[PDB]
């Protein structure tokens, strides 16, 4: 029999419904349960897990018709885990108004429209042929369909349950099928021996929440886990002297940041937000805590000034009231050590910030949040599109977190979705970046160097994204 794989994780997603589970913790599970029309071939052409190449997966082939539509020829005989055959009806449902982007859909799939292009309703042409299309021109459709938007869901089963219940009992076409969920504890998957692609190599995969990185390292050493997630470069020393273990790391296409609840009076205006941003010496943090392996971003592409931060603190009228910084422990690698360094930096600017460490499983009330840490996946190669997906008009930073973005910012967000790459689009990018930095609705810290640790007897390479790929990349040694 095949070996059981045990993964010690930083957390579980709130749902296994593909869109509702988008987070640092979901894709590593969702990628196993589902397939998309298109897969990212991370290891193509000898790449070290970072190739952006997209290849056919549930679509056997596809051909663009015009600037707003693509015809897909689906792979035949593919079965969902309940035995139902995957047809054009399921692909059309996946990208339908009813499930994904309509007004009613987004009440149970809240980011269905935010993470989509401007879809029009899919057209089913025959059992294995579907046209996916946008209402306005888009040369990103294939990219969206190969992203975390893309998992194909079973129409009849999904409709019978609704998105919330489907998220607790998912059915997909992927190499591992859902077995069990214990909230805040684990998810167990089992091999899908009916898989259409390469046969799964593990009998079961268990994702077990172990909140603290030191405790995860101890469980790898003790033999409780085969792979552990969400470590830092500094954790590499803790594995010194274990011949059977190693670290495996890579830069990933994710930005660690901090952000604000701009409904709060102290953060309704930009002045103090920008002071908090300018006070941070990001190179010092990268040197200190990341062994210079994390990467300071060039904005949202796929300045430390303490003098100006002090000036803005005084201009803001800030009165010395302690400002909390909410962090779910070290859910983000290096969260608490980085916060400690930033608290020192903020003190030097005249701002008192204190940690508010909350437990795994707890969702603070939005009204208790002043500053919080967060991350954003860079989930398409087009960084403008992913920035807009969180910071644009009607998206969550404005709608939920109260950022009163300048009208010009919102105007340019709309313009860049219609412009082709070139001079005008890059000029809009530059101006959006300047406004974003002036407004400081969030502050980008760095792209983390994601570190896993694993048994040498489990052959598996990381990829440059907040997920785990096992296709062609999970072999057990004797």
Ligand X SMILES: *OC[C@@]1(O[C@H]2O[C@H](CO)[C@@H](O)[C@H](O)[C@H]2O)O[C@H](CO)[C@@H](O)[C@@H]1O
Instruction: Report the nearest approach of ligand X to the CB of residue 284 (Å).
Output: 23
Cβ-count burial of 60 within 10 angstroms (0-12 exposed, 13-18 middle, 19+ buried)? Answer: middle
262: three-class secondary structure by DSSP = coil
> Dihedral of CA 460/465/466/467: which sign?
negative
Helices 306-316 + 270-278 axis angle, to 10: 160
407: three-class secondary structure by DSSP = helix
Reduced DSSP (H G I as helix, E B as strand, rest coil) percent helix, strand, coil of the chain, to 5: 30, 25, 45
Nearer to ligand X, 187 or 312 (CB): 187
Nearer to ligand X, 200 or 441 (CB): 441
Instruction: Report the nearest approach of ligand X to the CB of residue 23 (Å).
Output: 4
Separation of alpha carbons 149 and 134, rounded Å: 15
Q: Which residue is nearest to ligand X (CB)?
A: 14
Joined tokens for residue 399: 């709608």
Joined tokens for residue 144: 């969206």
Separation of alpha carbons 348 and 179, rounded Å: 52
10: three-class secondary structure by DSSP = coil
Instruction: Report the nearest approach of ligand X to the CB of residue 17 (Å).
Output: 12
Nearer to ligand X, 167 or 383 (CB): 167
Please name the helix (run of DSSP H) or strand (run of DSSP E) that holds residue 219, with its range, or none.
Answer: helix 213-222
Nearer to ligand X, 219 or 329 (CB): 329
Nearer to ligand X, 331 or 429 (CB): 331
Nearer to ligand X, 56 or 110 (CB): 110
Instruction: Report the nearest approach of ligand X to the CB of residue 69 (Å).
Output: 33
Separation of alpha carbons 391 and 383, rounded Å: 12
Nearer to ligand X, 270 or 372 (CB): 372
Residues 94 and 80: beta-carbon distance below 8 Å? no
DSSP 84-135: PBP-HHHHHHHTSIIIIISTTGGGTSTTTTTTS-SBPPPEEEETTEEEEEBS
Instruction: Report the nearest approach of ligand X to the CB of residue 81 (Å).
Output: 24
Separation of alpha carbons 126 and 122, rounded Å: 12
Nearer to ligand X, 69 or 263 (CB): 263
Going by C-alpha positions, the residue among 195, 240, 253 that lies closest to residue 33 is 195
Nearer to ligand X, 222 or 362 (CB): 362
Instruction: Report the nearest approach of ligand X to the CB of residue 109 (Å).
Output: 14
Instruction: Report the nearest approach of ligand X to the CB of residue 38 (Å).
Output: 25
Contact residues for ligand X (CB under 6 A)? 13-14, 23-24, 328, 331, 362-363, 372, 374-375
DSSP 308-324: HHHHHHHHHT-----EE
- Whole-number Cα distances in Å, 380 to 84, 117, 406: 31, 12, 25
How is the beta sheet containing 371-377 ordered, strand by strand? 353-357, 323-327, 371-377, 254-260, 442-446
User: Which residues partner with 377 through β-bridges?
Assistant: 254
DSSP 462: -
Instruction: Report the nearest approach of ligand X to the CB of residue 28 (Å).
Output: 13
Nearer to ligand X, 300 or 331 (CB): 331
Instruction: Report the nearest approach of ligand X to the CB of residue 372 (Å).
Output: 5
Going by C-alpha positions, the residue among 388, 459, 395, 390 that lies closest to residue 428 is 388
Nearer to ligand X, 369 or 428 (CB): 369
Nearer to ligand X, 331 or 409 (CB): 331
């Amino acid at each position: 029999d095949r070996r059981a794989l045990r993964i010690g994780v930083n957390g579980l997603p709130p749902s296994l419904e593909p869109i509702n589970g988008i987070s640092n913790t979901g894709p590593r599970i969702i990628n196993q349960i589902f397939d998309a029309l298109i897969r990212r071939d991370y290891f193509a052409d000898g790449a070290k897990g970072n190739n952006i190449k997209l290849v056919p997966a549930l679509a056997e082939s596809f051909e663009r018709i015009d600037d707003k539509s693509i015809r897909f020829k689906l792979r035949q005989g593919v079965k969902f885990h309940n035995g139902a055959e995957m047809t054009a009806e399921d692909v059309a449902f996946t990208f339908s108004s009813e499930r994904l982007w309509g007004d009613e859909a987004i009440k149970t799939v809240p980011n269905g429209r935010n993470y989509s292009p401007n879809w029009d309703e899919p057209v089913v042409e025959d059992k294995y042929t579907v046209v996916l299309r946008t209402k306005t021109p888009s040369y990103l459709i294939e990219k969206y369909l190969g992203s975390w938007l893309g998992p194909i869901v079973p129409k009849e089963y999904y409709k019978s349950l609704g998105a919330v219940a489907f998220g607790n009992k998912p059915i997909g076409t992927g190499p591992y099928k859902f077995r069990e969920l214990v909230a805040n504890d684990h998810v167990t998957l089992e091999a899908n021996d009916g898989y259409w692609g390469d046969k799964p190599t593990a009998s079961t995969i268990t994702y077990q929440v172990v909140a603290e990185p030191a405790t995860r390292v101890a469980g790898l050493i003790s033999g409780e886990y085969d792979i552990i997630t969400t470590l830092t470069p500094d954790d590499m020393a803790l594995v010194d002297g274990y011949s059977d273990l190693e670290t495996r790391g890579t830069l990933i296409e994710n930005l660690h940041m901090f952000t604000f609840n701009m409904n709060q009076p102290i953060f309704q205006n930009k002045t103090l937000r920008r002071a908090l941003a300018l006070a941070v010496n990001r190179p010092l943090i990268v040197e200190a805590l990341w062994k210079n392996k994390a990467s300071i971003p060039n904005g949202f592409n796929f300045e430390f000034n303490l003098k100006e931060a002090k000036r803005l603190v005084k201009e803001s009228g800030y009165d010395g009231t302690p400002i909390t910084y909410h962090t779910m422990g070290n859910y983000y690698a290096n969260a608490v050590p980085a916060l400690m360094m930033m608290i020192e930096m903020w003190k030097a600017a005249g701002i008192t910030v204190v940690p508010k460490i909350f437990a795994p499983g707890t969702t603070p009330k939005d009204s208790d949040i002043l500053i919080r840490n967060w991350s954003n996946g860079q989930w398409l190669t087009d960084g403008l599109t992913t920035m807009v997906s969180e910071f644009g008009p009607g998206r969550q930073v404005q709608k939920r977190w109260g950022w009163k973005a300048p009208a010009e910012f919102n105007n340019l967000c709309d313009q860049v979705a219609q412009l082709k790459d070139g001079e005008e689009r890059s000029a809009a990018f530059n101006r959006l970046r300047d406004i974003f930095e002036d407004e400081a609705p969030a502050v980008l810290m760095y792209q983390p160097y994601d570190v896993y640790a694993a048994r040498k007897d489990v052959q598996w390479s990381p990829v440059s994204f907040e997920t785990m790929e096992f296709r062609g990349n999970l072999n057990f040694k004797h």
